Structure 1
Amino acid sequence: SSFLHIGDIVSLYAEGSVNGFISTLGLVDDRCVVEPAAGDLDNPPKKFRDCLFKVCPMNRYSAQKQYWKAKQDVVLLQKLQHAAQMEQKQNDTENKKVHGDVVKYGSVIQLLHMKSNKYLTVNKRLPALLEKNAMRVTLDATGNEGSWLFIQPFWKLRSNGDNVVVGDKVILNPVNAGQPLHASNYELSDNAGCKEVNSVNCNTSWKINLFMQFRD
């Protein structure tokens, strides 16, 4: 028994309509999928590196978003770029300083997929490819405000402000979209046996399995 610390490498096991780990398609694809037939908790999938995520603290993207909006006047753009770089440095320093802190229920976190080195993001302005009634979950290198995720309890024996214990089932609720991640039953045409991950109200829960710690 141990608590969840910022910087730990963890795996998420969906236990809802479809049971399986969170995986990402190879190449430069930015789609998160769940493959129930790949493996389970007792028999993890052979390729047990695409399902590993790292917990990171909240980051500030106001200056970066403003710079992107301006880019999409030369002096203003250059100063916005400088401000964005300074904000990135400040975020890196804050991550280094907050490294090793315990994660509490109701707190905002980010999930960095290590193999692709990309933050998991949810876009509230883009419907999902298959389930048109759900929003789109993807992976972004730089990241945006959609990477924020409230780590909410799933069981009633856990309350806000309590430390997260390894092995618990939790809910990852995007701050902006406001609808928990859902492992839909839709199957991708391109890849067989894989199920989509989107953002829509459901009863899905994610079990947190510890793989490595920050001190290790």
Structure 2
Amino acid sequence: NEMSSFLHIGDIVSLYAEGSVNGFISTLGLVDDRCVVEPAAGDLDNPPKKFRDCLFKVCPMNRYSAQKQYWKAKKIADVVLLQKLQHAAQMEQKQNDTENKKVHGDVVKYGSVIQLLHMKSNKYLTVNKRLPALLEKNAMRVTLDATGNEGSWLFIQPFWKLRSNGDNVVVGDKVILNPVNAGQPLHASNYELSDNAGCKEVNSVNCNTSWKINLF
């Protein structure tokens, strides 16, 4: 009765929320960038249909400073500068590919930063501190983004007493996902989507939501 396994970078997992509502965090398609929880869809004892759409891959923290610099950048000296920034952004993207490969399989520790890549849409969960959530106006917006950015960084923190910063995250653990930039944990709200009955908005705001991480 003591068996268990650790969460590793590269693992494919589902995240089951227990906050304002309970349920797996899922999506609405390959285009829609909203994240939701459909409590009635299913639970841990009875998984929803097309459960594959609830899967995310645990990824390392990517570099995004050069990419951001290039965006802001959007006279010959300026055209050259722009080309230089474009190249720096490309090199950064290549650096992430290279460096992320080196940490594949590494154990995920509490206190570390991770990114969650939605498998089906191939987009990262992202929290935008400068944009209010769609439904719960006091919260910050959570969306799926193909390239991801600084808003994709998430601290995986202890939810239970027995876990401390630096401990390995154990499969089955209930954890707190706290976006690095936003500053408030991922929240499973009870705000119903008007165009998708039964689906609740996932956002970022001061809350007590826990996320149970399970392998597939």
Tell me if both proteins adopt one fold, taking TM over 0.5 as the criterion: yes
Contact map agreement 2:190 2:201 (CA 8 A) in 1: yes
Deviations 1:93-117 (A, max 9, x none): 0000111100000000000001000
Deviations 1:85-137 (A, max 9, x none): 10110110000011110000000000000100001100000001111100000
Give the C-alpha shift of residue 33 in structure 1: 0.5
Contact map agreement 2:126 2:153 (CA 8 A) in 1: yes
Give the C-alpha shift of residue 26 in structure 1: 1.8
Q: Does 1:153 align with 2:154?
A: no
How many residues are treated as equivalent by the alignment?
Answer: 210
Secondary structure of 2:100's counterpart equals helix
- Aligned residues with identical type, % of pairs: 100
| Inter-partner Cα distance in structure 2 for 1:208 and 1:34 | 15
Give the C-alpha shift of residue 199 in structure 1: 0.4
| Inter-partner Cα distance in structure 2 for 1:4 and 1:209 | 9
| Inter-partner Cα distance in structure 2 for 1:154 and 1:190 | 33
| Inter-partner Cα distance in structure 1 for 2:72 and 2:14 | 34
Give the C-alpha shift of residue 27 in structure 1: 4.3
| Inter-partner Cα distance in structure 2 for 1:77 and 1:39 | 50
Give the C-alpha shift of residue 146 in structure 1: 0.5
Question: Where has structure 1 moved over 2 Å in runs of 4 or more?
Answer: none
1:111 to 116, 141, 149: 116
Q: Normalized against structure 1, the TM-score is what? A: 0.95
Contact map agreement 2:26 2:35 (CA 8 A) in 1: yes
Give the C-alpha shift of residue 156 in structure 1: 0.8
- The 1:165–1:132 alpha-carbon spacing in structure 2 relative to 1, beyond 3 Å, is same
| Inter-partner Cα distance in structure 1 for 2:59 and 2:31 | 23
Secondary structure of 1:2's counterpart equals coil
Deviations 1:148-207 (A, max 9, x none): 000000001111100010000000001111100111101010110000000001110000
Give the C-alpha shift of residue 75 in structure 1: 1.4
1:84 to 82, 89, 111: 89
Secondary structure of 2:184's counterpart equals coil
| Inter-partner Cα distance in structure 2 for 1:49 and 1:68 | 34
- The 1:27–1:163 alpha-carbon spacing in structure 2 relative to 1, beyond 3 Å, is closer
Secondary structure of 2:72's counterpart equals helix
Q: What is the RMSD computed on CA atoms of the aligned residues?
A: 1.3
Give the C-alpha shift of residue 76 in structure 1: 1.2
2-11 vs 63-72, which deviates more? 63-72
Contact map agreement 2:29 2:121 (CA 8 A) in 1: no
Contact map agreement 2:19 2:189 (CA 8 A) in 1: no
Give the C-alpha shift of residue 49 in structure 1: 1.5
Deviations 1:13-62 (A, max 9, x none): 00122000011012410000000010111110111111000001111111
| Inter-partner Cα distance in structure 2 for 1:77 and 1:143 | 21
197-206 vs 69-78, which deviates more? 69-78
| Inter-partner Cα distance in structure 1 for 2:135 and 2:19 | 18
Contact map agreement 2:60 2:113 (CA 8 A) in 1: yes
Give the C-alpha shift of residue 5 in structure 1: 0.5
Secondary structure of 1:93's counterpart equals helix
17-26 vs 70-79, which deviates more? 70-79
Contact map agreement 2:14 2:214 (CA 8 A) in 1: yes
Secondary structure of 2:97's counterpart equals helix
Secondary structure of 2:191's counterpart equals strand
Give the C-alpha shift of residue 74 in structure 1: 1.6
Gaps of 5+ in 2: none
